[PDB]
A paper describes a structure:
The recently identified bacterial Sir2 domain-containing protein, defense-associated sirtuin 2 (DSR2), recognizes the phage tail tube and depletes NAD+ to abort phage propagation, which is counteracted by the phage-encoded DSR anti-defense 1 (DSAD1), but their molecular mechanisms remain unclear. DSR2 contains an N-terminal Sir2 domain that serves as an NADase effector responsible for NAD+ hydrolysis, a C-terminal domain (CTD) that functions as a sensor for detecting invading phages (as discussed later), and a middle domain (MID) that connects the Sir2 effector and the CTD sensor. DSR2 forms a tetramer with its C-terminal sensor domains (CTDs) in two distinct conformations: CTDclosed or CTDopen. Monomeric, rather than oligomeric, tail tube proteins preferentially bind to CTDclosed and activate Sir2 for NAD+ hydrolysis.
The phage-encoded protein DSAD1 (DSR anti-defense 1) directly binds to and inhibit DSR2 activity. To elucidate the molecular mechanism underlying DSAD1-mediated DSR2 inhibition, we first purified the DSR2–DSAD1 complex, which showed no NADase activity, and then determined a cryo-EM structure of the DSR2–DSAD1 complex at a 2.5-Å resolution, in which approximately 60% density was observed, facilitating the accurate tracing of DSAD1 and CTD domains. A structural comparison using Dali search revealed that DSAD1 shares no structural similarity to reported protein structures. DSAD1 consists of eight β strands and one α helix between β7 and β8. Each DSAD1 binds to the CTDopen of protomers 2 and 4, with the binding pocket of DSAD1 located on the backside of where the tail tubes bind. When attempting to dock DSAD1 into CTDclosed of protomer 1, we observed a notable clash between DSAD1 and CTDclosed, supporting the idea that DSAD1 exhibits a preference for binding to CTDopen. Notably, in addition to the extensive interaction with CTDopen of protomers 2, the β1 strand of DSAD1 forms an anti-parallel β-strand interaction with the β strand from the MID domain of protomer 1. Superimposing the structures of apo DSR2 with either DSAD1-bound or tube-bound DSR2 revealed minimal conformational changes upon DSAD1 binding with an RMSD of 0.425 Å, but significant conformational changes in the CTD and MID domains upon phage tail tube binding with an RMSD of 2.419 Å.
Author numbering:
A (entry chain C): 11 to 126
B (entry chain B): 336 to 463, 467 to 495, 501 to 565, 579 to 636, 644 to 897, 911 to 1005
C (entry chain A): 22 to 74, 79 to 462, 468 to 629, 645 to 670
Amino acid sequence: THDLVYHSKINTFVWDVEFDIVLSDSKELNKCYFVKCFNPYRINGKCDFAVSSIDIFSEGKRLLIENEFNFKITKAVHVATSKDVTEIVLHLSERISSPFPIVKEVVYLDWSHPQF
Amino acid sequence: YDYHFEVNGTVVRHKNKGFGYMERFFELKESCDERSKLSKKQYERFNALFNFFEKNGVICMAKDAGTLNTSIEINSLAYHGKYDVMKKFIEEQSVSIEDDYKKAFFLACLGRWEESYDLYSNIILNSINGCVYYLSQINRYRIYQSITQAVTQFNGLGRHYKPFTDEFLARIEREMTNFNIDDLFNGMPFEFQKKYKILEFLSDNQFLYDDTVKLFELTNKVSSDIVVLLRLYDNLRFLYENCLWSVSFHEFHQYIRNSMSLLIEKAEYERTRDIDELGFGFFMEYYDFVNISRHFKIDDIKNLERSCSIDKIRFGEQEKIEEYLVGIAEEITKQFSANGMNVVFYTQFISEAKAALYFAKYVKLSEEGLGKIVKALLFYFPERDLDIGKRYVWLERLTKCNELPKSIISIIDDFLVLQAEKHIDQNYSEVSSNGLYSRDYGALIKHFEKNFISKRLSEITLCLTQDKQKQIDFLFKLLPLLSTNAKSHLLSFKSVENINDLMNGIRIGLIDEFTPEHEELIIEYLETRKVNYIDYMSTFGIWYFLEEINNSKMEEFIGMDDQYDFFVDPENFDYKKFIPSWLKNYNDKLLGKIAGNKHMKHHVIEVLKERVKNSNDKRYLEILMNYFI
Amino acid sequence: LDNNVVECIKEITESSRNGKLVFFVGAGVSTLSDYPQWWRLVDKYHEELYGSPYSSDEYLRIPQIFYNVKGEMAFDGILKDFFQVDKPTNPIHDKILAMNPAHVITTNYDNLIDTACWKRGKYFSVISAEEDVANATSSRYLLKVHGDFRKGFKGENVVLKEDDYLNYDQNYPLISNLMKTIIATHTIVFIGYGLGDYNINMLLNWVRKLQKDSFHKPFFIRTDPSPIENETLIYYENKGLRIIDAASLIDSNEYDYLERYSAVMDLLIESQENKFITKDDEVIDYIYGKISPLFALQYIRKIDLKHVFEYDYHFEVNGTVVRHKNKGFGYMERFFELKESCDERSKLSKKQYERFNALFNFFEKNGVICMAKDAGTLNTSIEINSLAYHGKYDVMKKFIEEQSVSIEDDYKKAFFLACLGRWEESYDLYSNIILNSGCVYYLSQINRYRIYQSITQAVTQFNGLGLLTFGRHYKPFTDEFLARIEREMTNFNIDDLFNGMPFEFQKKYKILEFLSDNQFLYDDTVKLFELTNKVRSEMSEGSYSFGMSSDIVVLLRLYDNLRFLYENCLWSVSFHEFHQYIRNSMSLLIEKAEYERTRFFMEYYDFVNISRHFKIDDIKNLERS
């Protein structure tokens, strides 16, 4: 946990790890991660409430979430050091109490906005 | 060291105990009567001296200094990015060996490093004052270093490119084997080492250590700024007008970065100190814009933007900056619309083009120049450097000083139709590093027009069938741009049967108004969750609080999700269950609506105050300060 | 190869690195470029003198007879029609040039070496006539001892006939004197000669007249098809020659002279980067040769150690070494392997064991631990062993009152006098140290120039603003002292102080060159600006990193400077730029500590740094932020 970074603008953790997870439909995914984009100035519609948009990437290609994405992490693996970090992932997820506590990378779209 | 020559052009007696020849020269210059006293040879020598001193910006002594005008003016095609003119100059036949030195520099600046090395070798052959010979040796060593580093980087890096043939690499490795740049100056004729001592620093590994250490004066908190800026201009003019390739090296780029960043930070510090004391400085011009574009990375510009208020920095010579940006756009088009891609040139040029188009946010651009820049950015900027999201960010930055005209809206519409055409293929998927996709361009168009209907996308939609699914779920995110007929045709390809389809429709913008059947579906899901009690709950609560739902039969499910109970009825919520991190997930609209509720406002104000006092969190502080939630 | 051959290679390459290598190029190198040999000219002279076609003396006598009989005009005509040709330059010419010789002496009257120098980009003052010696435009000579045809293809411009060789000393006194001086003052390698050449034996005869050991033995690249006989080798090596035989090194055909020359030349060139390190004793010897001069200095900045080893390694401020540009043997890795393994220490020689112990002490006291891959939990407490740093004013006064037992005591006393404001006494003591002193001499020169600058600035302030500031015009320095120090320092140039030094100092103490200017602060300044930008960007986005802090380098480099400048008693501690550097480093550290507090603690050293290097406004800015 030496490259683990806590981003506090949106209370998440940037960690270079992959997740093997199972949803509520028994579907299995391997070597998947998440990328969060903090967009406070995004041009929202009437029904958008989140300040961040999250994209799930498995095997280097993103997923189109058509079903409910309620999922449980079965095995989290740190890429740099192949040591299993699943227990730390669940600990942080229980502590953080935010959607997708651990994220591969956080993109900040505030400073590059014309309204910044 | 007989005199100091200051960056403003004033001379000061420093260390000569003999005659004041500089003062006498200036006295001769000011008044013509004593000029006739000189001999004819002395008269023409004085004329040459006067031309040299006025060309180098040396006016008079400090004691006689008056209204001193210090305007930077670099006579270099390489500095101004006149790539077409540089190519024309290289195409021409070089009359002199000094034209060959300029040609070799221009070849280096255009990425043609093999030709530049060959020309420098030829100049070294034909050059034995011997000042071009020494400069050619310096620049050939520099270009050999550049070639070596580029070969290393290309071996390290998205497609394997071989710009330099291995025979050329071996030839230059053998030619420059055991070549000592340090021994170069000492091996020159003893007259050269006397007349051209000032050139010896060009053989050093580092030559900007002094200028960098004097940058600490900009970090003092107790003019230095003018001295630093004029010193930077002096270095730039010397390295570019004299066609020295070390101007492209990381040391010089880092020096320019450090000096400009510290100057802007210092100006910001003076502005804030004055505001603190006076209760209500750096004025950027064409040369500063070009320096930042050429030498700053995007991360460096982002550090500048977060550290200081660049919007409080007014920009001058905006017609010159617009010409620079239009030239950058034209070169982007030439490099990528055609097959003119030079990989060596591309590596150095793409960073400057990116930085220039990023910094163009602060520049007012004419409609035609904005059209050129926007078209080049949207269509001819390579996707390996600027993906769909990054290119959208760059484009949207251009609306800060130029509210979207009709021509730019048409260009973005052309881009959207091209993206839709790319979605004929089922395999094609947009790759974005920012999470921003083609939907964001249409969102921007509708933001700046509110009534724009794109005819070509409507035509594409009306031609759509059920087979090419990719086009339907692409154009669904672009629904506001379509016409009524196109909207009706598209809406037939999706169903809202179950609650998951409803969530998909809201997320992709399929439906923006909640019908009673959607409310019934939401209630069905809520009843199922309540029954199975012994992710969408917060979303439904937020929708009810945002007046997106007026069903009023939701209070049955209070007590399962804390956020849902908080949003459905703020008055009856117990705020020991409130999690402050919730406020970090809401956007501007939701936070503002929470602030204006007249309920739960004081509870969340106390929560934000506790978070600010306990943790000194900048996000919580700015949330509490902006919306006063 | 053979051990003595490897020693010859080492000597030649060391001389090439030092710029003291001179190449003596003979007719063999020109012959490989197909330049007409002299036996054809003698054949033509015999054809004109007699019916149809020699001894060693005949090669000179037959042209002499042709001259004396047929005329200088006929001799001129034959020379012109034989030697007016264009021939390419050998790869051997380029190899000789790539060896970077200080001078190229040659008996060749062709311009093949000239053409090679012009093509490769080397500027040599071509001295082929007597008048060229005084008119040479540089200190690097292409000395054609037998003339050439630059003026014209005339027999008077060259040494060809018998009479030319008999009257050579009379006709070429300046050229012969210059050649012998270059031989005496440089390392000479003979290439293109047959070990029986007239010039070789004349030079060996002159060498006989010299003192027993007053000269260095010239090297002789022998490229004859057959290996040298042992008796011939002993005879010529006892005459002052060190022979490297091309035939012994590699096997080739009798007429294949190009490969014989190229074997030795490429073996010399490829050995330029080679350090010839195989055993642990060689590793210890090389590292000791690099490090032992630094034993004079109390402390060495770890960022300076990359210059000691010529960028072979990165020496990080945490004490870890990393491969940077060392394509040869890893001597630092081997040294650390010897350090960790006690058994392999005993394998070292008797001298090498003590050398390794000295190296171990130097590296341990300088905080150099291991390589990056073997790094464990690295924690180095900062301790600056200086009385001046700790403000021990009474102790420095008592130490000054004591009698000096060495010149290092005098150097420390001069620094302490500078730190106590006794700048006149400090300047006088630095002058005395300069008289009696070359590390201490150079450092005293730097510190005396710095203290003279301090005196000048203080006098300017006292005369201009001291009277107003103090209410009384203070005169700490008498006009006599000011005039004397101005006279001593009027022509002193700090920039050329390092250059005007023995070459052994400029090589052993390359890292001390940075103390002449603010170049010694350049790397730390650049790193500080970079890390300041990085840290402030991290705080702006609100991210917290778990693990090693990003500012630790800023701290470590900081204490790398204070320890270096104070323990080595350098007046640069008083520099305004150094104070700004320390102030910025400490300000960044305190800002980062405050940022992580609400998510480093102030010690004695941090308190002293803030007190010494911060103005009150800087402290107030920190208190505000």
